[PDB]
RNA sequence: GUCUGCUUAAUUGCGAUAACGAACGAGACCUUAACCUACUAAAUAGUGGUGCUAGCAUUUGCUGGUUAUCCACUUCUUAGAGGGACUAUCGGUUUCAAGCCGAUGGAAUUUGAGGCAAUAACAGGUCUGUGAUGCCCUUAGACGUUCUGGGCCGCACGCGCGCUACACUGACGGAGCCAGCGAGUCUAACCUUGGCCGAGAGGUCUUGGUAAUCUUGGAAACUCCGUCGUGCUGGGGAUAGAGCAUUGUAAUUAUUGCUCUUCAACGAGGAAUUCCUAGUAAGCGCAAGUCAUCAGCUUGCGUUGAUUACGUCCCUGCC
């Protein structure tokens, strides 16, 4: 379908691929959904990256961070274990990984097993800390669901990241090994065995 | 004659030279087109702006991109507005007038840098402590 | 290193879907030093077809 | 390129100088379970000599032990450009040679007790268990 | 276990000691004439949108 | 008639007398009508001497950044020994250094 | 029509490296297997062997990318920061000696020569050698 | 924040009540025109006078 | 006068007022980072055109090399003059006062940032910077001067400031392969290439450079292409044995380095408790300050670069 044919052939397979189409040319974000009403709103299903980087003014406006590609509040974390601690490009060089070893374990549309392990792993039934005394409580009251996703990301990060840690495991096969077992969520993962260890904190101070 | 315009290119340090005149084909970065990225992992930046419009309109279009300034990400942003700048200089001063607008509502949706680059600062340092807003160590 | 160790690799890594050398110590257990070797190999039309990149992951695959 | 069919002389433990060694581990080191030899005189032992780098341990030929237990102990002779040494001048008995296993042990010893017979500061700072190259330690 | 979606209509004044709650109205979306006031966590909005499988405690203003 | 390339090299702290000298120079020479340039302005040497307050340790860690900041600047002028010398003599001045390195 | 530039930075290094391995003319200096290249590297190049043949497509690529430079300048380029330990981390300028020798030995057939301001400029041959390998590196990637 | 000061106020006050005949609301118009009239120090301060005025004929109507 | 109130980064300003109008501080001002396709010039910055030219194409093309082959340029890169932004323009929001949001244009949270920093002081520190200096003491068996040797580096331990790491989101390796702050030899040894000798650490011939003119355009995080495969390892690099080097009259209480082997803890850090609102937090480097050397510190820079608010008086602290 038209190659175009310009010295320099700038590709006929990175052109058909992505004129026929936008989005990611490995994955296809073109009927990928989400399923829960509550995390539509606040978790962009994709403007477009056709990769997986925006300078980033997301946080002046108190707000943005909604408009924040998921993906790249991902890459965003990570972010860390401190001294990476400014790392992104070997944050996408690993999480360009991630979306390859959930496409390939499952056989899955993967940017959706990604956006699946939001909403499941967000905690809705949480406490807070009423001053109160000494000791009180803990008055039991669902997060905005802002702020639940805001979790949802921060929780999946400090138990895929154990996992390498004097690990034969290279966060590319921990991170896929903890989403797929943290949407079907399972318990071999680490939220729905913390989320969950909250909600179950909250249930009493109720 | 010749038919060349012509831009400049700027994202916290250095610039392009988008020279972009009448040739057959041609996309020279550094001396060394653009398929030969250099810093091979954000190699999809630059690919957007080719395809984000007709790889149809840079066949006409030369561009003999020189890249200096602003460590390899800076610039990136600087080649990418190259194109796009002058996208819109071509589209500008030669190709109409509309072409600038039936573009930049294309090139406008990102609706990022592109077009119109970066403007935060680094901030200026002080005395007592190390980043920026870091003030020494406290005592008693 | 012995003799049921790459015969038990090529009958069990065909269409064994999903390999690395992360893979072959946690499933065959010793050695990593070597794995990313006996995998690799060749690459006789009846090994692994692969979406590997660089040194630095190596993420093979299924001929089919 | 393959798993190679290691037959028994893969041979399961090592042993090179009495000081032991252990054979299925990727050899340079293993010959580092040492005293006096580590990866610099190990690399020239083995380009020296008629080696694989990267077999192990216990993988060894013997006539590749036996010429890897001799170049070692000889130094100036496989060329071993004497700025590449530890016994560089005796100054007692020169010489050119290495300080080895069982003997960096007892050569560490020999070499405090001509200094402690003189009564002077580089061998009496290794004398009082406190250090001779000048600092404040207290910390430590 | 039964999910109650309940929506924020009118987000009314900061409490706690350390302005970690807003207060809350609530619409339930899924009965909307119901218009209930619990508290909650976070940095809100009119709008969100917001979950409880506790339908319902009715909670009274915590220091 | 002996023609000599001569080039004009100026700095100050005052950015008001030492303009006044490219416009007085190059149109106490446009004058004259001078084959010259307009004046070149060399980039913005800027000295920041950090130095503490106090006198005495004591006292918060509480410093300063006094600077000289010139204005460096250059020109050109062809014209024999007599009117370069009549040109040099006039611009005559507070603030300012200049010299005439010569190109016979 | 086909350039030094059009082509990747390693394949030109392993397909210029595998031309000057197979050449035999290249000649081979005499701490050129031992000898640590760079001091702050503990190992020197792990292949002992004909990095030299990897830094005779380098150095060369490297001239031609420019005008001139060399020994005192491929002395600031290979070789890094350093590994002071505890002392925090520092660079470390290489040894003029080895390509002070590949800059003596490229001279002999007509690849690198000498710039007149001086020291390496490839000649007229030498680019000829080049532009016939740079198209040969080309259609490995082709 | 953003909070309106005397020296301003009190110069488009005293201003306001002569020249509101020339008066405007494209304020890009007064701007000139408030140099013309006032004996301004500063080009901030001037912009920060026309600015309080515009919120006065923006409201008056 | 110097204030109920509203106002701000602010005794910063409208307004209320037997209080009228001024001085210092703050702000104004000076430094630097941004912008000027307008000026002014550049074989110590670079363009095309020009040959001379070395390859691939042969299609005129594509890839070069050339401190002069010539010139012509001045976006670039430097840098002088200069200009330029005031929260501007409507819209709101208010005592429709001072002010505060938002969206457009814009290069552009006090434009960012420092530096100067009254009023009164503190018996904070310092005569161990002084040939600034009171008064005591010292004056040749001196507490003054100087050749040596050790000493401030001595450890069961108590307390701070810090470096690498508990991984496959990493360690090892080829192969891509990228800045900015500097500095620098003169009366003599500061930077060193290049081209050799050394596995290496280096050695050296010889070279340039009082420096946009030389070393000096090639720094690391990384993209490359993979080996390692959940094995305290192929994370960890402790402590050790020798040699070989490179300085230093002195290398011992190994100044550093290399060459190869010994393979110490720790498997994410309790009662505590810091610093931080944007190129900001933090990590990967390097040039200077020492200096003959020996950085795990001091300073300064950039190259990648986000979370989280953009608000309160719960606290401390001070007004």
């Known amino acids: 379908f038209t190659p175009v044919v310009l010295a320099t052939p700038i590709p006929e397979e990175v052109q058909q691929a992505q004129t026929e189409i936008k989005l990611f040319n490995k994955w296809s974000f073109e009927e990928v959904e989400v399923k829960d009403a509550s995390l539509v709103d606040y978790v962009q299903v994709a403007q477009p990256i056709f990769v997986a980087h925006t300078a980033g003014r997301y946080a002046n406006k108190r707000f943005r961070k909604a408009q924040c590609p998921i993906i790249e509040r991902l890459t965003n974390s990570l972010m860390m274990n401190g001294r990476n601690n400014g790392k992104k490009l070997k944050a996408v060089r690993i999480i360009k990984h991630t979306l390859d070893i959930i496409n390939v374990l499952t056989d899955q549309n993967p940017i959706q097993v990604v956006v699946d392990a939001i909403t499941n792993t967000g905690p809705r039934e949480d406490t807070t800390r009423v001053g109160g005394g000494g000791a009180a409580r803990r008055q039991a009251v669902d997060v905005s669901p802002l702020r639940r996703v805001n979790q949802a990301i921060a929780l999946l990060t400090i138990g895929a990241r154990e996992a390498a840690f004097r690990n034969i495991k290279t966060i590319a096969e921990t991170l896929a090994e903890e989403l797929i077992n943290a949407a079907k969520g399972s318990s071999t993962s680490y939220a729905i065995k913390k989320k969950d260890e909250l909600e179950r904190v909250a249930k009493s101070n109720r | 004659a010749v038919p060349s315009v012509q831009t400049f290119g700027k994202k916290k340090s250095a610039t392009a030279v988008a020279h972009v005149k009448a040739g057959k084909g041609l996309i020279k970065v550094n001396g060394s087109p653009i398929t030969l990225v250099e810093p091979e992992i954000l190699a999809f930046k630059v690919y957007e702006p080719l395809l984000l419009v007709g790889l149809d309109k840079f066949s006409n279009i030369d561009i003999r991109v020189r890249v200096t300034g602003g460590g390899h990400v800076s610039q990136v942003y600087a080649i990418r507005q190259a194109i796009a700048k002058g996208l819109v200089a071509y589209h500008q001063k030669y190709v109409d007038e509309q072409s600038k607008n039936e573009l930049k509502k294309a090139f406008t949706s990102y609706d990022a840098t592109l077009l119109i680059a970066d403007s935060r600062r680094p901030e200026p340092k002080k005395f007592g402590g190390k980043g920026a807003r870091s003030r020494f160590q406290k005592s008693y | 290193l012995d003799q049921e160790k790459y015969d038990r690799i090529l009958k069990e890594v065909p269409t064994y879907r999903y390999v690395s050398v992360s893979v072959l110590v946690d499933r065959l257990k010793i050695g990593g030093s070597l794995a990313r070797i006996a995998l690799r190999h060749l690459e006789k039309e009846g090994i692994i077809k692969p979406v590997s990149k660089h040194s630095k992951q190596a993420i093979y695959t299924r001929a089919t | 390129s393959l798993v190679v069919q290691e037959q028994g002389s893969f041979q399961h433990i090592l042993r090179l100088l009495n000081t032991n060694v252990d054979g299925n581990i990727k050899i340079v080191y293993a010959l580092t379970t040492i005293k006096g030899v580590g990866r610099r005189y190990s690399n020239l032992v083995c380009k020296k000599a008629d080696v694989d780098l990267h077999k192990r341990a216990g993988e060894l030929t013997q006539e590749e032990l036996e010429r890897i237990v001799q170049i070692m102990q000889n130094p100036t002779h496989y060329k071993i450009p004497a700025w590449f040494l530890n016994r560089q001048n005796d100054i007692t008995d020169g010489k050119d040679y290495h300080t080895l296993a069982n003997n960096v042990e007892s050569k560490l010893r020999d070499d405090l007790e001509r200094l402690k017979k003189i009564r002077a500061h580089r061998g009496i700072r290794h004398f009082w268990g406190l250090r001779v190259r000048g600092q404040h330690t207290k910390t430590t | ?63 | 008639q002996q023609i000599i390339k001569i080039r004009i090299t100026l700095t100050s702290t005052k950015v008001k007398q030492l303009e006044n000298v490219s416009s007085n120079i190059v149109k106490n020479a446009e004058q004259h009508n001078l084959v010259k340039k307009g004046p070149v302005r060399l980039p913005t040497k800027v000295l920041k001497i950090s130095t503490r307050k106090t006198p005495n340790g004591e006292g918060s860690k509480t410093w300063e950044t006094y600077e000289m900041r010139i204005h460096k600047r250059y020109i050109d002028l062809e014209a024999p020994v007599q009117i370069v010398k009549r040109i040099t003599q006039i611009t005559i001045e507070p603030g300012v250094d200049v010299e005439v390195v010569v190109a016979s | 029509g086909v350039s030094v530039r059009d082509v990747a930075a390693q394949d030109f290094i392993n397909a210029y490296a595998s031309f000057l391995q197979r050449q035999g003319k290249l000649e081979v200096p005499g701490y050129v297997d031992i000898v640590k290249t760079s001091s702050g590297n503990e190992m020197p190049p792990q292949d002992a062997e004909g990095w030299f043949y990897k830094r005779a497509a380098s150095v060369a690529r490297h001239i031609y990318m420019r005008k001139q430079v060399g020994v005192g300048k491929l002395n600031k380029l290979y070789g890094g920061a350093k590994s002071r330990g505890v002392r925090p981390y520092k660079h470390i300028d290489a040894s003029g000696s080895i390509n002070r020798k590949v800059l003596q030995a490229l001279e002999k057939i007509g690849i690198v020569e000498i710039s007149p301001k001086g020291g390496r400029r490839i000649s007229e041959n030498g680019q000829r050698d080049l532009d016939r390998i740079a198209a040969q590196t080309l259609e490995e990637d082709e | 924040g953003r909070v309106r000061t005397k020296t301003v106020k009190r110069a488009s006050k005293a201003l306001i009540e002569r020249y509101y005949p020339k008066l405007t609301l494209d304020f890009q118009t007064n701007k000139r025109l408030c140099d013309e009239i006032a004996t301004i120090q500063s080009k901030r301060l001037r912009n920060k006078i026309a600015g309080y005025t515009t919120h006065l004929m923006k409201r008056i109507q």
């Open chain 5, 1 to 63: 276990t039964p999910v109650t979606l309940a929506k924020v209509i009118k987000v009314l004044g900061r409490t706690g000691s350390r302005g970690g709650v807003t207060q809350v109205r609530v619409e339930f979306l899924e009965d909307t004439s119901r218009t209930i006031v619990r508290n909650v966590k976070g940095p809100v909005r009119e709008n969100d949108i917001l979950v409880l499988m506790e339908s319902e405690r009715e909670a009274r203003r915590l220091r």
